[PDB]
Antibody, heavy 220, light 218 residues
Framework: QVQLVQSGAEVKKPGASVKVSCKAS????????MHWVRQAPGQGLEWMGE????????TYNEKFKGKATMTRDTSTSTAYMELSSLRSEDTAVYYC????????????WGQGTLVTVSSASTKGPSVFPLAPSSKSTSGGTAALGCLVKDYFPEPVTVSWNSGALTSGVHTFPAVLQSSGLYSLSSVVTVPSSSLGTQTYICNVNHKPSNTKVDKKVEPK | DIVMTQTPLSLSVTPGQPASISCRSS???????????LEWYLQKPGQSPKLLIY???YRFSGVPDRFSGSGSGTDFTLKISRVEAEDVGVYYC?????????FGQGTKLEIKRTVAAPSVFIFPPSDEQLKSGTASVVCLLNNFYPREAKVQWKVDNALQSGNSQESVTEQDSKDSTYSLSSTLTLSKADYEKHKVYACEVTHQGLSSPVTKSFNRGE
C-alpha cells in the first residue's frame, strides 16, 4: 500500500523559510523519484521539480530555482522541500507525488500542505457544537455539526468519529470575516432514533496554531 | 515552457450524455522515446489530483471504460462516453514529455439533475459561545438543486443586513446536490434583546418561502 504523508499546514512571515516534509511508506523509497507540485491561486498547478532519492540529485523548474530546495532522508524515507525568502506569491498547496511505473506520470500523491505567507498573526479556532434538536430534524433524520469560529490562516480539517463517520457529512468551505478571521461549519445528518446511543465527535485540526479539538456534540 | 490550453473552461452534462474536453499544447509534446506523455487528471475540492489517462489513451487502474483519450501533435481530447454523478470536479491535462512538465488551466465538469428542494435546519448559539460574549445562529440548507438558493435572516420579523456570512458546498459526488451554511453573528447583549430568530429560504423547489425559526430561551 503506497502512501505519501505530508507535514501539516504552516503560516510564515514574508522573508522567512519553510521546510515541508513528505514521509513515504508502502514501497522502497529509493526506487522512485520524488516530485513536487505547487497549486497556487490563479497560477493553477505547476511542476516544481524532482529528487532522485538514491543520491539526492535534483532537477528543478527554472521558475523555482533559488526559491525551492529539495532534499531527502533515506533513514526515515522522508523527502523535503524548503522554500526560501517567502513572499505572498508563495501561498499555495505543495504536493509530493511519485510515478510507480518508473516514468514521470504521477499516480500517487501526498494529501498536500497549504503554506500561507502572511504578516498577520495566527489564531486558533473556538469549536462550538451545533446540537441536534426538534429544529434540526427532517423525515426521521437529525442534522448536527460543529461551528469552527475565528481562525487564521486556512485550513481547518474536520473528521467525524475519527474518520468512521463519512456519510451525510458536509464540511463547508471557510468564510472570511471582516476581522480577517476565517470561520467554517461541518454538519452531519444521522438517524434521530439513535441520538441516545450513538456518540458524535467532530475532530477539528488547525495545524498552523497546533489546535486539536475533539468536540462531543450532545443532543438538546 | 510548453503552454497547455484546455477547452471549454466548464461544461454542464446530464448523466448518461457524452462529454468532451480538448487540450492544446503550445509546442509538440513528443518525448525522446517517441511516446507522447499526455495525462488526464481529475481533482475534487480538498483532494489531490487522480490519474485517469496516461500516454494520451491508456487508462489507469480502476478508471471506467467510459473515459477515453485521443490526439496528435498539439490537439488532444478526453472523452466521457456517458457522464456519471461521480465525474464532478476539475479535469486537467498534463505533459510529462519535456522538462519542465506543465499542466492545463483545468476544465470544471458540473452535472445536471432534477430540482431538489432543500431540507432547512436552524441551530441556536451554544452556551459555550454565549458565555464568551458572542451569539452565532446557523441556518443549514441541505441537499438542494439548483445551486441558487436565497437565505434571509429575520430577527423579531425584522430583515437583517450585514451581520451574516454564507458558503455553498461543491457539487455532491453521489447525488449531484449542493448544501448551504449561513451564519448570523450578533454580540451576546444584542442576542438577548430579541426573541424570534428565523431564516427564510427561497428555492426553485419551494412554491413559497420556508421559514425555520426558534424562540430564544425555549
Amino acid at each position: 500500500q503506497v502512501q505519501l504523508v505530508q507535514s501539516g499546514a504552516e503560516v510564515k512571515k514574508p522573508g522567512a523559510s519553510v521546510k515541508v516534509s513528505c514521509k513515504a511508506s508502502g514501497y522502497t523509497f529509493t526506487d522512485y523519484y520524488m516530485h513536487w507540485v505547487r497549486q497556487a491561486p490563479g497560477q493553477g498547478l505547476e511542476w516544481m521539480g524532482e529528487t532522485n532519492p538514491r543520491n539526492g540529485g535534483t532537477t528543478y523548474n527554472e521558475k523555482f530555482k533559488g526559491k525551492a530546495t529539495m532534499t531527502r532522508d533515506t533513514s526515515t524515507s522522508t523527502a523535503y522541500m524548503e522554500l526560501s525568502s517567502l513572499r505572498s506569491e508563495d501561498t499555495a498547496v505543495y504536493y509530493c507525488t511519485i510515478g510507480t511505473s518508473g516514468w514521470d506520470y504521477f499516480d500517487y500523491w501526498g494529501q498536500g500542505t497549504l503554506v500561507t505567507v502572511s504578516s498577520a498573526s495566527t489564531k486558533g479556532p473556538s469549536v462550538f457544537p451545533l446540537a441536534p434538536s426538534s429544529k434540526s430534524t427532517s423525515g426521521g433524520t437529525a442534522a448536527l455539526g460543529c461551528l469552527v469560529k475565528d481562525y487564521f490562516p486556512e485550513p481547518v480539517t474536520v473528521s467525524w468519529n475519527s474518520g468512521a463517520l463519512t456519510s451525510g457529512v458536509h464540511t463547508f468551505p471557510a468564510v472570511l470575516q471582516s476581522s480577517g478571521l476565517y470561520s467554517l461549519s461541518s454538519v452531519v445528518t444521522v438517524p434521530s432514533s439513535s441520538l441516545g446511543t450513538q456518540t458524535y465527535i467532530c475532530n477539528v485540526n488547525h495545524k498552523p496554531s497546533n489546535t486539536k479539538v475533539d468536540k462531543k456534540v450532545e443532543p438538546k | 515552457d510548453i503552454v497547455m490550453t484546455q477547452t471549454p473552461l466548464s461544461l454542464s452534462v446530464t448523466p448518461g450524455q457524452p462529454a468532451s474536453i480538448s487540450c492544446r499544447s503550445s509546442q509538440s509534446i513528443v518525448h525522446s522515446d517517441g511516446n507522447i506523455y499526455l495525462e488526464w487528471y481529475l481533482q475534487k475540492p480538498g483532494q489531490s489530483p487522480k490519474l485517469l489517462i496516461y500516454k494520451v489513451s491508456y487508462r489507469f487502474s480502476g478508471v471506467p471504460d467510459r473515459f477515453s483519450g485521443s490526439g496528435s501533435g498539439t490537439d488532444f481530447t478526453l472523452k466521457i462516453s456517458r457522464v456519471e454523478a461521480e465525474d464532478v470536479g476539475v479535469y486537467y491535462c498534463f505533459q510529462a514529455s519535456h522538462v519542465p512538465y506543465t499542466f492545463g488551466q483545468g476544465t470544471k465538469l458540473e452535472i445536471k439533475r432534477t430540482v431538489a428542494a432543500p431540507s432547512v435546519f436552524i441551530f441556536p448559539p451554544s452556551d459555550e459561545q454565549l458565555k464568551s460574549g458572542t451569539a452565532s445562529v446557523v441556518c443549514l440548507l441541505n441537499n438542494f438543486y439548483p445551486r441558487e438558493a436565497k437565505v434571509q435572516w429575520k430577527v423579531d420579523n425584522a430583515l437583517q443586513s450585514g451581520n451574516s456570512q454564507e458558503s455553498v458546498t461543491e457539487q455532491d459526488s453521489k447525488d449531484s446536490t449542493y448544501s448551504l451554511s449561513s451564519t448570523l453573528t450578533l454580540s451576546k447583549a444584542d442576542y438577548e434583546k430579541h426573541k424570534v430568530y428565523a431564516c427564510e429560504v427561497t428555492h426553485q423547489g419551494l412554491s413559497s418561502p420556508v421559514t425555520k425559526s426558534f424562540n430564544r430561551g425555549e
